[PDB]
RNA sequence: AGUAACUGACGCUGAGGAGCGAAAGCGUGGGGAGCGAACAGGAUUAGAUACCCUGGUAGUCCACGCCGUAAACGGUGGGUACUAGGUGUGGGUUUCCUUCCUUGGGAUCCGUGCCGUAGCUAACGCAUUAAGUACCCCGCCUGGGGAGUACGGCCGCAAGG
RNA sequence: CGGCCAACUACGUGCCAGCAGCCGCGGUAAUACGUAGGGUCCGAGCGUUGUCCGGAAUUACUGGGCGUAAAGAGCUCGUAGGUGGUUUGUCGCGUUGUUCGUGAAAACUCACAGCUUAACUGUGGGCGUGCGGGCGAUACGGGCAGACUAGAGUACUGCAG
């Protein structure tokens, strides 16, 4: 039940990892060979894990659930952004505000304020006050919309979190673990498998490999929203 | 550990050594 | 320490057979020769304490080997003691 | 219906250029008396407010005690920080025998008959933590049989099975 | 030097268990094999076997972990040790975890658990506790 | 370290005991450039039995003996087995890139650092060189002063221990 | 009758007179002193002092510790002692099962009985944790007689300081 074949993600460079020095000894399970000072990830484990990840995503979205797309490293920013937009799902691309999930009630007020300021823009109140105030207000609008791109659809909570390069966004994974929300991650050779539930071994430093993985997850969630 | 304890011990030791020096001949003659 | 020819001669003399070097007899004989050489050396250099510590270590090792040989078989112990001119 | 135990109120203070700023910390136990307990430690400038934060924190963190009828499954010893609390099951009708912090935790958890002793670090917060650590070391006999893959009779003594039978009959 | 082979075996088991190793190897002896048999029959380890080492024989023990990666052994303590040795009569046999654990006892009829020894009315040396 | 030819448990610890043990100090005999307790002046200071300056004796050095203490500290007794890794550096054996020049790289045994898991700890931190997990033996602790002092004893030429 | 620790007000006094097991209360508005109301705990008793155990895991066998809180001898060698790898046979010393003798009575504990109840008394079991004799077992420890090479040591070849 694999959308992509064993050559697809291999061409992208999913078997690539990090240097042997910066490896995590807990990943010896999925390590297949070390070449040119870098570790090569076995792809058979990747396939037999992405199938399970696909199944979990299907059963979560089909039962009236949502997934949250996480990626901040510049390699996998536009990919997650465009996939979330094309499937209409929440996403974070600029920067993870520490405590979106744990401090949900407080950060929802930011969305309320953004909507209020959009209404103020629609009514046209740009001249009723001082120029400094309206300039600062426009700057606040830009900052709030830029930092919260996919956050305007957060009603209750993300039922699952999809994350690239867990080492980079350790705060988001930690927040999910605190809340108990299942986390689906693609772990590189330097990552910790004890924190994710549904790992997908592979490279995250390549734009193409992360893009392909986002394609796979987006297809899963799209078909699941099809089968509601 | 604080040096205060070392200071107390050293003052006791210094006073005792001074006392021993002050009565050397007296101790020798009584012993 | 002893040269290879001295070791060969001592081992041929005190060894249990023509190949053994780790028998308590051979070890004790070699230790006795080493200790005599060290005592002669220390008779001249009285203030060579570092070598004297090695002398003490050799003496202790020989004592332990003799203890083992006496516990295993007293006749061998007596023969070795009389042949090497030792007291205890 | 939830019972609560405010076991300790402490007035802490931090120094500033003007002087001392006093606040209040309250350690609160929340349980239902049926097998679930929670521990909260709230701090605020006023005692009732701190108690409220402690109560909400205790309600947030809940944990189920493996009771067998009216007592714990087996003797345990739990240590947290420098606090050491030992727990020992007792025959029915003995009552709770514990110090103030341990007594509060056990009565909140619904334990009726137990011998409990504190063996270090009389501090109430650490004694409560040690009691919770001890309670978290208890293992239900069914889980024990599952771990070793044996029938419940081959793992537990007959007395425990009889006690379970009587408790479920009642 | 090595003083207690049994304690060393127990600590190898404990250290492997804490590190979630699936395998532990140690030099072989009849006593170690017998307590391994008792451990396997009581369901505390998965399986064991003896290979041949470079000098003598080895003991290979498989550790049992549950589906959620939870250890099947909670503790391993050596009771009777060189120096202070512990012997129990048939009536004052120790209880481990209030009966939830197993106490290995070396009786003249072989290696038995506390329940087996109590049933057969024999005493001996309390080797260890498992729970 | 390698070979493993030899012996075949001969191992570990060790009360008491014996030996070694920085510097200062002590005895006898030499030596004495520089430095330099004590001691002299000068200066600073309210006062300088000090800091600073100019001199300067024991001592520092050698031979042979005493003494037996130190923040004699890693403030961590010795032996053994096990428990993620990463990276420097010292000693030695070896396979493969092979130019075989090259820290080429790997593997391995023995050291010596740094960073870091699990675990431990009151915390700081330790963390395969444990302060982790265990076993054997030894030394020591039991609130702070009085006091490592008095008394008695042993050792020492004495200081004193 | 402030908190530990059931039970609070008024008047008098004012760093006094006094109280106090500890923390500590007496500075004209004391629930801590003295006295009155009220209250609480016990009750033919109630308090104080003295002594022992407990709390005290605060001598830690059960059941503690030693980097910085008190605590690793300055370091080694080694005596007595303690402790000891794999394996075969044997002994039955330790260990273990059973049996017999003994472990006075009283006491303690269980049941019953008699004092109008209780204290108390009696009766019958248990207990008397032990020791001695016979018989059984040999897993472990130990002894005895062997064996093995992974510890330990020797030999040989190199090596660094």
Swiss-Prot record, chain A:
GO terms for biological process: translation. Transmembrane segments: none annotated. GO terms for cellular component: cytosolic small ribosomal subunit. Signal peptide: none annotated. Keywords: Ribonucleoprotein, Ribosomal protein. It comes from the Bacteria. GO terms for molecular function: structural constituent of ribosome. Disulfide bonds: none annotated. Belongs to the universal ribosomal protein uS2 family. This is Small ribosomal subunit protein uS2. It comes from Mycolicibacterium smegmatis (strain ATCC 700084 / mc(2)155) (Mycobacterium smegmatis). The lineage of its organism: Bacteria, Bacillati, Actinomycetota, Actinomycetes, Mycobacteriales.
Curated annotation (Swiss-Prot), chain C:
The keyword Ribonucleoprotein applies. The keyword Transport does not apply. InterPro entries: Ribosomal_uS15, Ribosomal_uS15_bac-type, uS15_NS1_RNA-bd_sf. GO terms for cellular component: cytosolic small ribosomal subunit. It holds the Pfam family Ribosomal_S15. Keywords: Ribonucleoprotein, Ribosomal protein, RNA-binding, rRNA-binding. GO terms for molecular function: rRNA binding; structural constituent of ribosome. Part of the 30S ribosomal subunit. Forms a bridge to the 50S subunit in the 70S ribosome, contacting the 23S rRNA. NCBIfam families: S15_bact (TIGR00952). One of the primary rRNA binding proteins, it binds directly to 16S rRNA where it helps nucleate assembly of the platform of the 30S subunit by binding and bridging several RNA helices of the 16S rRNA. This is Small ribosomal subunit protein uS15. The lineage of its organism: Bacteria, Bacillati, Actinomycetota, Actinomycetes, Mycobacteriales. The gene is rpsO.
From Swiss-Prot, chain D:
This is Small ribosomal subunit protein uS5. Part of the 30S ribosomal subunit. Contacts proteins S4 and S8. The keyword Phosphoprotein does not apply. Belongs to the universal ribosomal protein uS5 family. It comes from Mycolicibacterium smegmatis (strain ATCC 700084 / mc(2)155). GO terms for molecular function: rRNA binding; structural constituent of ribosome. With S4 and S12 plays an important role in translational accuracy. Located at the back of the 30S subunit body where it stabilizes the conformation of the head with respect to the body. Residues 2-65 form the S5 DRBM domain. The gene is rpsE. Keywords: Ribonucleoprotein, Ribosomal protein, RNA-binding, rRNA-binding. GO terms for biological process: translation. The N-terminal domain interacts with the head of the 30S subunit; the C-terminal domain interacts with the body and contacts protein S4. The interaction surface between S4 and S5 is involved in control of translational fidelity. The keyword Nucleotide-binding does not apply. One of its GO terms (cellular component) is small ribosomal subunit.
Swiss-Prot record, chain E:
GO terms for molecular function: rRNA binding; structural constituent of ribosome. Keywords: Ribonucleoprotein, Ribosomal protein, RNA-binding, rRNA-binding. GO terms for biological process: translation. InterPro entries: Ribosomal_uS8 (IPR000630), Ribosomal_uS8_CS (IPR047863), Ribosomal_uS8_sf (IPR035987). Gene3D superfamilies: 3.30.1370.30, 3.30.1490.10. The keyword rRNA-binding applies. The keyword Cytoplasm does not apply. GO terms for cellular component: ribonucleoprotein complex; ribosome. Belongs to the universal ribosomal protein uS8 family. Part of the 30S ribosomal subunit. Contacts proteins S5 and S12. One of the primary rRNA binding proteins, it binds directly to 16S rRNA central domain where it helps coordinate assembly of the platform of the 30S subunit. This is Small ribosomal subunit protein uS8. It comes from Mycolicibacterium smegmatis (strain ATCC 700084 / mc(2)155).
């Amino acid at each position: 039940m694999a959308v992509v074949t064993m050559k697809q993600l291999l061409d992208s460079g999913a078997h690539f990892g990090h240097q042997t020095r910066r490896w995590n000894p807990k990943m010896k399970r999925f390590i297949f060979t070390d070449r040119n000072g870098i570790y090569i990830i076995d792809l058979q484990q990747t396939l037999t894990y992405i199938d399970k990840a696909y199944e979990f995503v299907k059963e979560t979205v089909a039962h009236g659930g949502t997934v949250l797309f996480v990626g901040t490293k510049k390699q996998a920013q536009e990919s997650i952004a465009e996939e979330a937009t094309r499937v209409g799902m929440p996403y974070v691309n600029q920067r993870w505000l520490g405590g979106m999930l744990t401090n949900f009630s407080t950060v929802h007020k930011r969305l309320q304020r953004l909507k209020e300021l959009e209404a103020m823009e629609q009514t046209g109140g740009f001249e009723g006050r001082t120029k400094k105030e309206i300039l600062m207000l426009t700057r606040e609008k830009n900052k709030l919309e830029r930092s919260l791109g996919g956050i305007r659809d957060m009603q209750k909570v993300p039922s699952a979190v999809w994350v690239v390069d867990t080492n980079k966004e350790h705060i988001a994974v930690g927040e999910a673990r605190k809340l108990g929300i299942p986390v689906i991650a693609i772990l590189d050779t330097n990552c910790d498998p004890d924190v994710v539930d549904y790992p997908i071994p592979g490279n995250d430093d390549a734009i193409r490999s992360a893009a392909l993985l986002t394609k796979v997850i987006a297809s899963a969630v799209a078909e699941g929203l099809q089968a509601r | 550990g604080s040096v205060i304890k070392k200071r107390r011990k050293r003052m006791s030791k210094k006073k005792h050594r001074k006392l021993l020096r002050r009565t050397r001949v007296q101790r020798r003659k009584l012993g | 320490a002893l040269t290879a020819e001295q070791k060969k001669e001592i081992l041929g003399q005190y060894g249990l057979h023509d190949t053994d070097t780790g028998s308590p007899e051979a070890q004790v004989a070699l230790l006795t020769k080493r200790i005599q050489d060290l005592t002669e050396h220390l008779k001249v250099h009285k203030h060579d304490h570092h070598s004297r510590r090695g002398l003490l270590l050799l003496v202790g090792r020989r004592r332990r080997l003799l203890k083992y040989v006496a516990q295993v078989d007293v006749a061998r112990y007596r023969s070795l003691i009389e042949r090497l001119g030792l007291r205890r | 219906n939830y019972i609560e135990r405010v076991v300790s109120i402490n007035r802490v203070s931090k120094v500033v250029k003007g002087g001392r700023r006093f606040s209040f910390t309250a350690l609160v136990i929340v349980g239902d008396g049926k097998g679930m307990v929670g521990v909260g430690y709230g701090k605020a400038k006023e005692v009732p407010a701190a108690i409220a934060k402690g109560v909400e924190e205790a309600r947030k963190n809940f944990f189920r005690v493996p009771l067998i009828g009216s007592t714990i499954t087996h003797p345990v010893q739990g240590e947290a920080a420098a606090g050491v609390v030992m727990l020992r099951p007792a025959s029915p009708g003995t009552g709770v025998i514990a110090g103030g912090a341990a007594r509060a935790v056990l009565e909140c958890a619904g334990v009726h008959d137990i011998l409990a002793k504190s063996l270090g670090s009389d501090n109430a917060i650490n004694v409560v933590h040690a009691t919770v650590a001890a309670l978290k070391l208890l293992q239900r006999p069914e889980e024990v049989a599952a771990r070793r893959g044996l029938p419940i009779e081959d793992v537990a003594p007959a007395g425990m099975l009889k006690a379970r039978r009587e408790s479920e009959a009642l | 030097t090595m003083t207690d082979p049994i304690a060393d075996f127990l600590t190898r088991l404990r250290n492997a268990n804490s590190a979630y190793h699936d395998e532990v190897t140690l030099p072989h002896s009849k006593l170690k094999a017998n307590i391994a048999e008792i451990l396997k029959r009581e369901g505390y380890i998965s399986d064991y076997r003896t290979e041949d080492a470079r000098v003598g024989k080895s003991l290979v023990v498989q550790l049992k972990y549950g589906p959620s990666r939870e250890r099947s052994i909670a503790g391993l303590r050596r009771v009777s040790k060189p120096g202070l040795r512990v012997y129990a009569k048939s009536t004052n046999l120790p209880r481990v975890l209030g009966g939830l654990g197993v106490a290995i006892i070396s009786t003249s009829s072989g290696l038995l658990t506390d329940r087996q020894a109590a049933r057969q009315g024999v005493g001996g040396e309390v080797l260890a506790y498992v729970w």
